[PDB]
Design a protein around this nucleic acid. Sequence first.
DNA 1: AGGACCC
DNA 2: AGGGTCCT
Length: 373
Amino acid sequence: SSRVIVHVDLDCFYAQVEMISNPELKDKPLGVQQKYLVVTCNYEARKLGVKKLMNVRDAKEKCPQLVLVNGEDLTRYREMSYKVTELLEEFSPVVERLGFDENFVDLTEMVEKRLQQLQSDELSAVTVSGHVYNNQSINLLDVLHIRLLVGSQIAAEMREAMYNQLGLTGCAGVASNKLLAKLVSGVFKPNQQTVLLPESCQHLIHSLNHIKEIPGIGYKTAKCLEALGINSVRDLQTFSPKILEKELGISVAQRIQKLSFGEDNSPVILSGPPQSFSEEDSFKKCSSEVEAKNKIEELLASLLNRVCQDGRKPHTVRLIIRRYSGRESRQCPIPSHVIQKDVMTPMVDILMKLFRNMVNVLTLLSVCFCNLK
DNA sequence: AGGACCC
DNA sequence: AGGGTCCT
Ligand SMILES: [Cl-]
């Protein structure tokens, strides 16, 4: 049973939000700064050589006119992110969030509903919206092609609604599973879409230049694969299954070897409301382990406002720390009476105990509310 | 708790 | 960087 999946990928998301907030930035090169880092930038800045996650000095020495806005407070980005997800959920309810700026939508049922409504002569006029990957020829008699073209039409409706209703541009990719939809959505950027017909799957997967470019193959797995002489997609396709299992475990080995062929049976999961709320701060050294209570009190204060708005409350609190020159965490249940929401002073007490439990009286402090109900 | 992955 | 997910 084949599926029609769309991957929606917002262009330079934080920059888009900031440009909407201050139109004066719309025509100037823009970078969103967090600490010493340019986490993202609009395309005007990318023209001038600015890259994501490029340190501010390197970025200013490449674009001295680069306008910098602070993006350490994620509140506005998070709000717009959920407006996108909710808009897509109106199309079809099964929407999976991947970070703040990507969504997967399973269009299968929607596509079949639209096809049922078409007349015979109507079927021969089905047209693609946007790009066809690798300029592949469409066969209107192929039912897989028809379904994917209808997927491309729904994807264009989504992108038009996002722009008309929210002012945001993004790319979309339409394919038969999540892996392929996500790989194909970035083929034409920015603000464009691409559909992958099945015959071009091997062309898409072999277009990658490192196995680390496969979604799901992270730093540790890549480093491990490279240690085995596996570098290209075809290397992973042809590597011995038995050895790969022994080195990576059978779960990781079998899944990522399927990914190397473009195979991905994973379902689109309805993300729904978030599973956790957290806030953090990075810094160079906080060994005044009495200022930590101040940092933790500030983080806790802002978090408390967010928990009130969601309406659901956390049943677990967690404190994370990073050690000077990799993280450690302590969690514990939140006492039931404390959940009625002055909750600061008890929360600080709980958190400090977790703190003291971990540190003997730091480059990061993070507080998380989780286990929601 | 810790580790893998994602943006 | 400042967030998130699920698995062991
Ligand atoms: Cl499987």
